[PDB]
Amino acid sequence: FLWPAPNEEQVTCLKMYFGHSSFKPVQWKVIHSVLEERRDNVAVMATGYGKSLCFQYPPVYVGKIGLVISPLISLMEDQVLQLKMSNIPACFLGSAQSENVLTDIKLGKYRIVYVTPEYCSGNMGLLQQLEADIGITLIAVDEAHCISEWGHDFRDSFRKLGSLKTALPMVPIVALTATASSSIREDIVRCLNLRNPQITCTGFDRPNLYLEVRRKTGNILQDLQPFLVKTSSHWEFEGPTIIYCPSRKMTQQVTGELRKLNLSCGTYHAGMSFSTRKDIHHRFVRDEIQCVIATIAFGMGINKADIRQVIHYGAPKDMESYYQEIGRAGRDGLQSSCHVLWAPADINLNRHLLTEIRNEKFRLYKLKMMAKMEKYLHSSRCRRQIILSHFEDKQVQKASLGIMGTEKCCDNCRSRLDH
Ligand SMILES: *[C@@H](CS(C)(=O)=O)[C@@H](NC(=O)c1cnc(C(C)(F)F)nc1Oc1ccccc1)C1CC1
Numbered sequence: 432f433l434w435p436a437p438n439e440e441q442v443t444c445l446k447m448y449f450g451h452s453s454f455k456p457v458q459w460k461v462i463h464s465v466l467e468e469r470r471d472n473v474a475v476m477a478t479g480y481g482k483s484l485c486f487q488y489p490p491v492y493v494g495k496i497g498l499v500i501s502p503l504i505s506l507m508e509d510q511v512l513q514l515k516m517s518n519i520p521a522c523f524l525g526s527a528q529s530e531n532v533l534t535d536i537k538l539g540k541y542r543i544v545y546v547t548p549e550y551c552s553g554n555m556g557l558l559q560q561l562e563a564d565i566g567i568t569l570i571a572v573d574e575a576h577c578i579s580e581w582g583h584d585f586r587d588s589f590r591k592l593g594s595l596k597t598a599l600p601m602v603p604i605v606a607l608t609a610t611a612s613s614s615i616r617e618d619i620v621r622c623l624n625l626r627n628p629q630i631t632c633t634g635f636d637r638p639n640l641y642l643e644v645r646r647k648t649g650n651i652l653q654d655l656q657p658f659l660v661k662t663s664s665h666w667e668f669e670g671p672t673i674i675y676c677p678s679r680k681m682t683q684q685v686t687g688e689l690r691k692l693n694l695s696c697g698t699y700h701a702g703m704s705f706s707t708r709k710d711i712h713h714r715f716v717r718d719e720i721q722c723v724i725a726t727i728a729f730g731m732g733i734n735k736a737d738i739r740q741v742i743h744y745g746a747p748k749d750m751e752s753y754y755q756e757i758g759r760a761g762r763d764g765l766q767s768s769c770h771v772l773w774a775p776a777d778i779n780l781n782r783h784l785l786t787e788i789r790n791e792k793f794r795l796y797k798l799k800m801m802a803k804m805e806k807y808l809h810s811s812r813c814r815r816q817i818i819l820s821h822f823e824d825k826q827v828q829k830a831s832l833g834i835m836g837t838e839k840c841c842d843n844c845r846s847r848l849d850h
């Protein structure tokens with residue numbers, strides 16, 4: 432149940448352009464705030480939990496323009512393709528765009544326009560014309576935590592986006608961050624000059640993720656044996672699989688062992704060229720590769736709808752990273768599994784890489800997130816209950832209540848059902 436209720440036209444539009452029958456409560460909280468109150472928002476949201484509807488839906492519903500600012504060009508191009516397949520006109524606007532498309536943007540032919548921050552600052556006159564002639568429903572600043580010098584993903588062009596509010600005072604900004612850090616949120620608010628923004632978060636309503644934690648020996652094939660099946664003289668996983676490793680070195684070691692089994696896999700980390708990463712990601716989406724072994728940072732992400740298995744090979748960096756990374760599994764809604772294989776000696780459990788972080792408020796935050804991860808690894812409680820417990824106030828959705836306690840929820844619920 433949603434308050435205030437979406438009207439029938441809003442629901443029909445949701446069905447027709449996004450294929451969803453109802454809004455998630457937090458999606459509606461952002462959407463309604465933008466449409467009715469023209470309110471700035473800081474949306475603490477992760478891919479895989481329903482992030483994109485919050486900024487793609489409003490311009491589609493009113494038939495106007497939504498501007499999405501992001502530094503991740505390849506991801507923006509993929510979104511343009513997906514939107515066009517869902518019959519939503521969208522484009523990437525850059526220096527190379529044809530005048531026919533640029534005039535089409537001015538005529539309001541496109542609902543969603545993706546731009547880089549750097550383009551955005553050099554063409555503010557264009558944005559004001561768009562607002563005057565057509566109306567900008569919202570500006571979404573994706574990867575907004577890149578504004579912060581200490582957030583390990585600093586991109587200085589984001590700090591120029593303070594000009595948006597001055598040029599377009601009546602246009603709400605939705606700043607999307609995948610960290611709940613208060614110091615980063617406060618910097619986002621002040622740098623962008625947001626006004627009394629609404630703060631929201633995705634939660635953990637992902638009932639199709641089975642969660643398991645088990646101890647790791649550190650012998651790679653022994654640890655990976657339960658996930659591997661030999662079929663016709665060939666080793667394979669049961670389905671498309673991501674293995675997240677804490678270090679690039681571990682990613683290469685794991686990949687090396689799997690290649691000796693003639694397994695179809697690819698590595699994915701920030702040391703690789705962009706062109707090679709793009710190829711690996713495309714091959715995984717098209718099922719030419721079965722397993723990606725990744726060390727995720729800097730807004731690298733793996734976007735594939737039918738990821739059946741996620742394996743954290745070693746303790747995750749912290750509780751937010753873990754939440755981000757399991758969220759990438761099972762986006763088609765079918766059953767998926769997320770396993771953590773960990774050991775006390777794991778480097779993310781022996782982090783002096785925090786004892787070196789410069790910013791004091793941020794270091795306290797990361798220490799807190801690491802403590803949460805450690806408590807989770809050691810717990811006998813329902814893993815889903817633990818994750819949800821970190822969203823103190825937040826309502827638990829019915830589907831999550833229904834899965835908890837059953838054999839498909841987590842390893843600890845399964846153990847309870849056995850005895
Ligand atoms: C917003 C959610 S709420 C309960 O409505 O205030 C809030 N988020 C969190 O407190 C929060 C806590 N813990 C975790 C996690 C997964 F690390 F355990 N996530 C989390 O949140 C998010 C963090 C990253 C991405 C999405 C959500 C904000 C502080 C106000």
Ligand SMILES: Nc1ncnc2c1ncn2[C@@H]1O[C@H](COP(=O)(O)OP(=O)(O)O)[C@@H](O)[C@H]1O
Nearest residue numbers: 451453454455478479480481482483484762764
């Ligand atoms: N309003 C909704 N109703 C039902 N399921 C939803 C809704 N919004 C998102 N989802 C589901 O949540 C998951 C995450 O959304 P998805 O579109 O894959 O990515 P993103 O989080 O980047 O928007 C998917 O499984 C998707 O089907």
Ligand code: NA
Nearest residue numbers: 449450451452
């Ligand atoms: Na659906």
Ligand SMILES: [Zn+2]
Nearest residue numbers: 813840841844
């Ligand atoms: Zn459980």
